[PDB]
Each structure stands twice: as structure tokens, then as C-alpha cells.
Design a protein around this motif. Structure first.
Motif, PDB file in Angstrom:
ATOM      1  N   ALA A  82     -22.168 -54.749 -27.836  1.00  0.00           N
ATOM      2  CA  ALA A  82     -22.842 -53.583 -28.408  1.00  0.00           C
ATOM      3  C   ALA A  82     -22.044 -52.299 -28.165  1.00  0.00           C
ATOM      4  CB  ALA A  82     -24.241 -53.459 -27.797  1.00  0.00           C
ATOM      5  N   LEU A  83     -21.419 -52.180 -26.995  1.00  0.00           N
ATOM      6  CA  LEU A  83     -20.644 -50.988 -26.687  1.00  0.00           C
ATOM      7  C   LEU A  83     -19.395 -50.896 -27.565  1.00  0.00           C
ATOM      8  CD1 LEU A  83     -21.141 -50.997 -22.861  1.00  0.00           C
ATOM      9  CD2 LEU A  83     -22.003 -49.227 -24.435  1.00  0.00           C
ATOM     10  N   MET A  84     -18.773 -52.044 -27.887  1.00  0.00           N
ATOM     11  CA  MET A  84     -17.669 -52.036 -28.838  1.00  0.00           C
ATOM     12  C   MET A  84     -18.109 -51.502 -30.197  1.00  0.00           C
ATOM     13  SD  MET A  84     -15.076 -54.987 -30.162  1.00  0.00           S
ATOM     14  CE  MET A  84     -16.329 -55.961 -30.954  1.00  0.00           C
ATOM     15  N   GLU A  85     -19.316 -51.853 -30.644  1.00  0.00           N
ATOM     16  CA  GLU A  85     -19.799 -51.287 -31.904  1.00  0.00           C
ATOM     17  C   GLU A  85     -19.988 -49.779 -31.814  1.00  0.00           C
ATOM     18  OE1 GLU A  85     -19.764 -53.027 -34.765  1.00  0.00           O
ATOM     19  OE2 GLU A  85     -18.967 -54.631 -33.524  1.00  0.00           O
ATOM     20  N   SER A  86     -20.502 -49.267 -30.679  1.00  0.00           N
ATOM     21  CA  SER A  86     -20.586 -47.816 -30.492  1.00  0.00           C
ATOM     22  C   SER A  86     -19.213 -47.168 -30.518  1.00  0.00           C
ATOM     23  CB  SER A  86     -21.290 -47.488 -29.167  1.00  0.00           C
ATOM     24  OG  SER A  86     -22.638 -47.970 -29.159  1.00  0.00           O
ATOM     25  N   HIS A  87     -18.214 -47.818 -29.911  1.00  0.00           N
ATOM     26  CA  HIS A  87     -16.874 -47.264 -29.876  1.00  0.00           C
ATOM     27  C   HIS A  87     -16.276 -47.223 -31.277  1.00  0.00           C
ATOM     28  CE1 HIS A  87     -12.532 -48.131 -28.265  1.00  0.00           C
ATOM     29  NE2 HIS A  87     -12.662 -46.863 -28.619  1.00  0.00           N
ATOM     30  N   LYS A  88     -16.493 -48.276 -32.069  1.00  0.00           N
ATOM     31  CA  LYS A  88     -16.014 -48.267 -33.456  1.00  0.00           C
ATOM     32  C   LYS A  88     -16.615 -47.113 -34.229  1.00  0.00           C
ATOM     33  CE  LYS A  88     -15.012 -53.227 -33.835  1.00  0.00           C
ATOM     34  NZ  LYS A  88     -15.489 -53.657 -32.471  1.00  0.00           N
ATOM     35  N   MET A  89     -17.905 -46.818 -34.010  1.00  0.00           N
ATOM     36  CA  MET A  89     -18.543 -45.691 -34.700  1.00  0.00           C
ATOM     37  C   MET A  89     -17.926 -44.360 -34.286  1.00  0.00           C
ATOM     38  SD  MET A  89     -20.792 -44.841 -37.004  1.00  0.00           S
ATOM     39  CE  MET A  89     -22.015 -46.151 -37.167  1.00  0.00           C
ATOM     40  N   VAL A  90     -17.706 -44.155 -32.976  1.00  0.00           N
ATOM     41  CA  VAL A  90     -17.093 -42.926 -32.456  1.00  0.00           C
ATOM     42  C   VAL A  90     -15.735 -42.675 -33.092  1.00  0.00           C
ATOM     43  CG1 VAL A  90     -15.982 -41.990 -30.357  1.00  0.00           C
ATOM     44  CG2 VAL A  90     -18.276 -42.918 -30.229  1.00  0.00           C
TER      45      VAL A  90
END
Length: 103
Positions: free
Chosen positions: A46-54
């Protein structure tokens, strides 16, 4: 409750004076390592998905509450607000600011 800053890829560049008390690591022990070195197994995807968004949008992104591995290999719960800033002449990320609230 503590600030860190990272490269576009997640490498720690800076932690503030409050971080070591929370996470155990001295700056010399954590700077130059990726944030992916510390996330709990159950949170990292899930944190990788947040990082992709950032990386893609120039707005703040707020993570879920996740577990972060401290120097003693126990976990604490954090929630982070991330925002990336791009150099307007190259389109590369200068840094990502992280406001890391502690539970």
C-alpha cells in the motif's frame, strides 16, 4: 511528530532532531537507506502505491497508518504526509518532504 526528507525514490536524505528518540536510528545509521527498508511486510504494498501517487501528482498524499521498524526491530505506528517538489528545468524530483505523525 518528526520530519524526514527523501529522494524521489525514497532514500532518506534528512531526519529532524526528534526522529532518533522515536525510531532509534541515529542519522548516520539511516541516511542513504530507502524507506522500503523499514516498512512492515503487511504495509509495504500500500505504501508503494502512495509513493507512486506522490511521484505523479504535485499535491500532498496521506498514507494509511502503517508500521515502521525501529532500531531494536520492534515496530511503531506512523501516519505520513508526503509531497514531492520537481525542478522546473529538468522535471526531476529535488526531494520529498515527509511529516510523520506517531501513534
Amino acid at each position: 511528530m518528526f520530519i524526514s526528507r527523501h529522494s524521489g525514490e525514497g532514500k532518506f536524505l534528512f531526519i529532524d532532531q526528534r526522529a532518533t528518540l522515536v525510531i532509534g536510528f541515529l542519522p548516520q545509521e539511516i541516511l542513504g537507506t530507502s524507506f522500503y527498508e523499514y516498512f512492515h511486510n503487511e504495509d509495504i504494498a500500500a505504501l508503494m502505491e502512495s509513493h507512486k501517487m506522490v511521484m505523479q501528482v504535485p499535491e500532498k498524499v496521506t498514507t494509511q497508518v502503517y508500521r515502521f521498524r525501529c532500531k531494536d526491530n520492534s515496530y511503531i505506528q506512523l501516519q505520513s504526509e508526503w509531497r514531492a517538489f520537481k525542478n522546473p528545468a529538468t522535471s526531476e524530483i529535488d526531494y520529498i518532504i515527509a511529516k510523520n505523525s506517531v501513534f
